[PDB]
Amino acid sequence: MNFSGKYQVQSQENFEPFMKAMGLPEDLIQKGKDIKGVSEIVHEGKKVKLTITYGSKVIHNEFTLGEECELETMTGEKVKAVVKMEGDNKMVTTFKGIKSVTEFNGDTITNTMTLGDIVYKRVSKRI
Ligand SMILES: CCCCCCCC/C=C\CCCCCCCC(=O)O
Ligand SMILES: CCCCCCCC/C=C\CCCCCCCC(=O)O
């Protein structure tokens, strides 16, 4: 039912603690929080690509469902991660030591990132 779609972020919880625990400068977050990022999901034969645009930068990625693929970080470091779907509105993806759960709906897309007791949730609407 749910396969590929355009979604736009409208709100996020927690910033300062999330970035601090990672390595993102508060300067960049402030500018990004006031800007509604963009999210585009491309579904092509089990191969789903995730695209995120920030201000004037476009980020494109590729991953295979039920298969561990190597993705680069914002620092250029190569990390291994396995993304798998659980079915309807439920998908389980874990990398290194962080738990990421994304709920897939035919109208809204929510992402859950937990690191160091920090809760990061992205709310996006269908467009
Ligand atoms: C898979 C890689 C995803 C990691 C990136 C997500 C973190 C977002 C970090 C910064 C977003 C803000 C960047 C926007 C460009 C700033 C504009 C400027 O250059 O002045
Ligand atoms: C925002 C990109 C950075 C993600 C960091 C985790 C690394 C895994 C990368 C790709 C596999 C994840 C794909 C499943 C989550 C989709 C979330 C969404 O639909 O908005």
Curated annotation (Swiss-Prot):
What's one Pfam family here? Lipocalin_7
- Where Phosphoserine occurs, the residues are 11, 39, 56, 100
The record lists (9Z)-octadecenoate 1 as bound by 31, 54-56
Where are the N-acetylmethionine modifications?
Answer: 1
Q: Which domain of life is it from?
A: Eukaryota
Q: Which residues carry this modification: N6-acetyllysine?
A: 84
Q: Cross-link Isoaspartyl glycine isopeptide (Asn-Gly) - where?
A: 105-106
Determine if Transcription is one of this entry's keywords.
no
Q: Please verify whether the record's keywords include Acetylation.
A: yes
Of the GO CC terms on this record, one is:
apical cortex
Q: Which GO terms describe its molecular function?
A: antioxidant activity; bile acid binding; chromatin binding; fatty acid binding; heterocyclic compound binding; long-chain fatty acid transmembrane transporter activity; lysophospholipid:sodium symporter activity; oleic acid binding
Q: Which GO terms describe its biological process?
A: cellular detoxification; cellular response to hydrogen peroxide; cellular response to hypoxia; fatty acid transport; intestinal absorption; long-chain fatty acid transport; positive regulation of fatty acid beta-oxidation; response to vitamin B3
Annotated positions of the Phosphothreonine modification: 51
Q: What is its main location?
A: cytoplasm
Where does the chain bind (9Z)-octadecenoate 2? 39, 122
Which modifications occur after translation, per UniProt? Deamidation and transpeptidation at the beta carboxyl of Asn-105 forms an isoaspartyl residue found in an isoform of the DE-III fraction. This rearrangement gives rise to an extra negative charge carried by the acid form.
Gene3D superfamilies assigned to the protein according to its UniProt record, in alphabetical order: 2.40.128.20
Which cellular compartments is it found in? Answer: Cytoplasm
Entry function: Plays a role in lipoprotein-mediated cholesterol uptake in hepatocytes. Binds cholesterol. Binds free fatty acids and their coenzyme A derivatives, bilirubin, and some other small molecules in the cytoplasm. May be involved in intracellular lipid transport.
Q: What else is known?
A: There are three fractions of Z-protein: DE-I, DE-II and DE-III. DE-I is virtually lipid free, DE-II binds palmitic, stearic, oleic, linoleic and arachidonic acids and DE-III binds mainly arachidonic acid.
Q: What is known of its domains?
A: Forms a beta-barrel structure that accommodates hydrophobic ligands in its interior.
User: Per its record, how is this protein called by name?
Assistant: Fatty acid-binding protein, liver
User: Which organism encodes this protein?
Assistant: Rattus norvegicus
Gene name of the record: Fabp1
